[PDB]
């Protein structure tokens, strides 16, 4: 299962034996982001705006803690866009799924998020964020052509293109009327 | 008069070429942006394995 969340994300659970369980979108006290971890400190300090205390020395007894098997997991490239356009917690793969089945799963859905006359700049900015890891040269270009339609002047070019997009059916109609005149006017020159 | 008649002709040609280029620039942008989106969808995605040691920053 995948689900979209708000940035910044911070979760710190104090454990009973005196360690702390941390999952956080940003670094603090040398703890890596995005991967969770069990954290212990030798001297009281403030991390993620709260106090992580040094635990009381304990006596060792025979353990019964479980040790689960490790597991690599491959996710779809655009998992973030799939989770965002559902607005609920959604199933994205299985532990033991093939590359082919995994891909043919949100492909039709994703293809039909096509370019529109009404949010071309907002679309072009998604395409860049999607392309950045694949082709960084193209991303930087797309991002540029994004900010040109949005920012340059008062966004007048964005406006102009948006409007010329919505007019398409009228233009064809006129274009057709011109041909029907031109053909007649031409045929009415030949002897 | 001849200069004004010539100017009108030359203006119309540059005005025609101006549009026929804009038609070609927009058409090429729509084709390339839509293909790249298709390729973005089918790329291999990230891998996660819960290894902390791997993500250490010094």
């Amino acid at each position: 299962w995948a689900e979209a969340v708000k940035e910044p994300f911070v979760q710190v659970n104090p454990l009973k034996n005196g360690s702390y369980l941390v999952l956080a979108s940003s670094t603090d006290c040398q703890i890596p982001p995005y991967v969770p971890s069990i954290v212990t400190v030798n001297e009281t300090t403030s991390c993620f705006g709260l106090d992580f205390k040094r635990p009381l020395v304990a006596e060792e007894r025979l353990s019964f803690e479980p040790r689960l098997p490790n597991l690599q997991l491959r996710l779809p490239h655009l998992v973030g866009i799939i989770a965002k356009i559902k607005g609920i917690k959604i199933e994205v793969t299985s532990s033991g799924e093939s590359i082919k089945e995994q891909i043919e799963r949100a492909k039709a859905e994703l293809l039909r998020l096509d370019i529109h006359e009404g949010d071309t700049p907002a679309w072009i900015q998604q395409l860049a964020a999607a392309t950045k890891d694949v082709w960084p040269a193209a991303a930087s270009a797309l991002q540029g052509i994004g900010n040109f339609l949005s920012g340059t002047a008062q966004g007048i070019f964005g406006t102009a293109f948006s409007l010329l997009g919505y007019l398409k059916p009228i233009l064809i109609g006129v274009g057709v009327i011109l041909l029907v005149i031109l053909i007649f006017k031409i045929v009415s020159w030949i002897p | 008069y001849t200069c004004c008649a010539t100017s009108s002709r030359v203006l119309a040609w540059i005005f025609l070429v101006c549009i026929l280029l804009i038609i070609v620039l927009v058409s090429c942008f729509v084709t390339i942006s839509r293909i790249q989106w298709n390729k973005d969808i089918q790329v291999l995605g990230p891998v996660i394995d819960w290894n902390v040691t791997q993500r250490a920053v010094y």
Binding site: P32, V41, E43 | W50
Partner: peptide, 23 residues
């Protein structure tokens, strides 16, 4: 007269371990 505050080094040890499968 000139009062100043010089920084002086120090450190706190921080151990970290993994949680297979996030369980």
């Amino acid at each position: 007269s000139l009062r100043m505050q010089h920084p002086v080094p120090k450190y706190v040890e921080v151990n970290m371990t993994s949680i297979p499968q996030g369980v």
